[model samples]
Target: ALPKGKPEEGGFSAERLKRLDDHMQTMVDRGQIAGGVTVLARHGRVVQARAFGRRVLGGDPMPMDAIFRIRSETKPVTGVAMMMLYEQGLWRLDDPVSLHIPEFANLRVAKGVDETGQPILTPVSRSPTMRELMTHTAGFAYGLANDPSSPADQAYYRAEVLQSASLTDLVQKVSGLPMFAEPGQLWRYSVAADIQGYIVEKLSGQSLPVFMQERIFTPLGMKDTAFYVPEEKQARLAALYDGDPATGQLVPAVEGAWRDVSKPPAAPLGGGGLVSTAGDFARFAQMILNKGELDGVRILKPETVALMTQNHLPEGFVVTTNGTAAGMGYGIDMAVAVDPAASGAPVGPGTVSWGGSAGTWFWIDPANNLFFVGMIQRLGGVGPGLDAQSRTLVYQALERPPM
Candidate 1:
């Protein structure tokens, strides 16, 4: 059973939420996705936690606790971990990453290609501040979706920065590559959150998993959230799928080449690489929506959470993912929706948000005092706007008081 709540009492209309179910099931009807497992909590209320569609073609339905790769959604969690450290006065937001990990201090930027098509390395005038790193302005690139033909992208691609053996190795590998831009000059999807993991490692003397376990997960009771799924729980692991771009037919995706979550990575990618379920992520979203505390467990002060969720980008700076996101800003390490209407999404303003590569999405809408977490394992099948559609449908259920 899902978390118990009444629609009118919880500020939702029973019928309106049914439309949300119908909206998703329509995609299921169209074979756009195999199935979905989702939870929506308003003001710390769990209004829905249910599974849909077929888990394994014509087989049993999806389980509510099914763990799927959370991808970049891990970034905001890493961001919260860093901010927790910030609350302890461990490091200031403006500190250069090189201050803690000296290896990154001498990193340079790619200005232009040399005669042999090599990147012309030029030193950055300013070191990337912690704030810049959190905001994707630290000049590090994800090494994909780059100008694949550019010498710089070639250099970034060749380093294979994601192949690191540990958080320490990730920092070293990042230093070995040229910066994507001078500090604070532009925005690029990058490995900056991984650097935050490195900082956590150096400062806390714990692995990323251990520190987050001690500080974040355990306290919030996020039992199914982890870097890897153990053997006993492996049965609940959702199958990954890819869509035939030409035919829209579904095919199984072969896992790996990236760090495998079946076995723990020597260096868990802080930027991405997490497996979580709808219920567990709902707790996380509720904590953020509750302003950093959940079930008497306080992770951050209200002001710190406010600081983390509010837009940290200055004028002219923007954070984009998958080469998109035109009207949003980066805050701490999460995307902050400053103007919901202007952003072209259905959610309200002051929403702290991020999503995973494998079609997982979540948002903490402080504007509405609510949060929504949706989980699915379709490779190229995000079931586009499922999150936005869910948002629209959820808010429409809100029982506004008589005028």
Candidate 2:
């Protein structure tokens, strides 16, 4: 277990920190969530740990170490995995993604559809660079857009990219799909992380799960972090929930790919695949906060961590599509708080952060030397909303300004 620090020592007011607990508990009581665990740490020690309510609404109380599906939050972990290989001189940011993944050698861009409902495609001006892939300017579609008005996004379904049998199959399927926009045109949250995972597998000669477990999880003491939960730890996996459309109340989620954690997956998604506990993910955040070293183990050099956290967006480009990240700059699968005020969040500049679709959230603040990990099982729909809400509550309690 990570060491606990006095709240004041961590530059927080203990009384104010209780607001976090109160906020979470009130949400639980209101049936917005079953329960959740929040961990806040600074200077490498935890200052506040909140675990409240139940894991399955009525079965068991939410445990501090309960594992939750950390969907898109897996992006940063995959980003770290990619950077580890970069340290070995395996790849470069400017290199075309096709250099490693040959299937992407020749790509097409989707403009619009004809009256007959066929996609009008054009040749890509250039291949997406590794940096573009990392920063989400690779012009790929996630097929997650609710409206999916673009032809490329619509093609994503016809391609059946997300249902691939393996990473190899995924690459093949993704390559055939037309680009949502020209490379480096706009920020589109995409399957680029999963593609990077395939690249990691190819370059390292190991599967994504094995490589991550050996290089990251084992060394970082993240025992419960994995692509899937095993038999013994299955009980600790929280039940997934969604909001009912009509009444807008939390209900058990009936569908989604990651629910079954009984065995290893055929195609483990680097974009949204990991199941992790609050404590386990805190260690990951702390390592980044410590600039790549945690508990005496060096996972990355401080320089690499700095590079990964800094903004890498093209000039004048803003993440306009995502409402929550309109003014922030993206960096290596995570959002960097380049302009906190513009993003409308009470966070310091240079803070690196990301959240899961299942209500899991985390951020590493360099300016304050702090990090936070919050875990909940709720998915889409009715909930008290924890991501931005928690951020507001946590930052308000910072009793001491940056030195």
Candidate 3:
């Protein structure tokens, strides 16, 4: 059975629990989201798990175990699966991606035009390594970021790349497109995780979902986590919301094109497209905190988790995104908290964390021996103020002794 904590042993006072509930209620009062579930655990014991507000505006109330679309949070799990293969001596970090996937060879870098006002393309100085793909330094474009009006972005939008392409196809298409920079030059959040998914498939000769389930999910007891909800479990799927910038209110998000996972498409997107509950994701986080073993199932070696959490970015390097936490640095498919003071995050140094496009967020704090999972269904609320507010709430509610 999963660990449990008594009210007194958990170190959480009634007042602190109330504070968390109050904050969640305030978010609903302000309409920031229709509802959310917040869970805090310490030393393998759950101290708090609460749900607030409605699941749907006029429907039934929200349940604590309500399943939500985890979006990009799937990356950490996918990364762990890849690292397991790494521990098995399947591949090395610096190996050229082209070594396994030949389609990535002959990549081109974007070059400014000559006096003739024509764009020029040049061969990349070096092939991108698998490590670069895991860390998002492979100089790929997200198709949503810089050069939004560029031909690539236009093609991405027109073709609905996420909807149409498999992970392998996506990587091949990205390789053929122009890169924002040479590999290992800068840290831009892109399709790196999806490429990692492709690598996992190529290395294991199994579909991404199949590899993850057999290797990670089934072992960890994440029974309901998947790319889509089955018809029987659709009732448990939480309602999605879009946060309003002006009033901090939440409106039902218009359902977008989503694939039915029953057919289990070739595109097992590591970057997003998974559904999980707070408890299931917390168990995953706890496994990482325990150095890759949970409930007697070993998914990764202890040393492998260490390598994945270590800051891989060069000194003086900064992710330029306006939405990212200030002092976090990119690691393998996750963000390593380097300077919590500068970043204004509640977690300690050496904390590894990442969140999804939906309101799912998690962090593994080795220094403090803590892990947290905050699950919500709001997308597009990634502003600094909202993030800071959430972090503050978490820190204030933490019942464990400070490291």
lDDT for each of the candidates?
Answer: 0.78, 0.84, 0.75
lDDT of 3 by residue, 27-88 (tens): 77877777778777777887777888887876778887788877778888888888988988
Q: Write the per-residue lDDT of candidate 2 for residues 1-403, one digit (tens) a residue.
A: 7899889888888888888888888888778788889999988899998889899966899988898988888999999999999999999998999999887876888888888877788888888999998988999887554334677877776666766789999898888888888898887788899899999999999999999999999999999999898999988989988775345377787754533666888888888889999989999999998899988999999999999999999777766312116668888889888878875878888988887767788888898889988888887533325767778888888987445
Q: Write the per-residue lDDT of candidate 1 for residues 1-403, one digit (tens) a residue.
A: 2256776657888988899889878777777678888887775667777799877656678878788888888988898899888988988987887888788777888887767767888877877888888888888876554464565556666776677677777788778787767888887788788788889888888888999999998999999889899999888888777775446477887855675788887888788877888877888888888788888889989999899988888898766542116568878888888877875676778787877777788888887787878887776636335766777788777776663
TM-scores for every candidate against the unseen true structure:
0.94, 0.95, 0.91
Better of 1 and 3 by TM-score: 1
Range of the 10 consecutive residues with the lowest summed lDDT in candidate 1 = 318-327
**Weakest 10 consecutive residues of candidate 2 by summed lDDT:** 318-327
Best-performing candidate as measured by lDDT:
2
Q: Which stretches of candidate 3 lie over 4 Å from their true place?
A: 112-119, 145-160, 243-249, 258-263, 320-324, 382-387, 398-403
Q: What's the distance in Å from true for residue 295, model 2?
A: 1.0
Residue-level lDDT for 239 in candidate 1: 75
Highest-scoring model, TM-score: 2
Stretches of candidate 1 above 4 Å error?
1-3, 145-147, 245-248, 321-326, 381-384
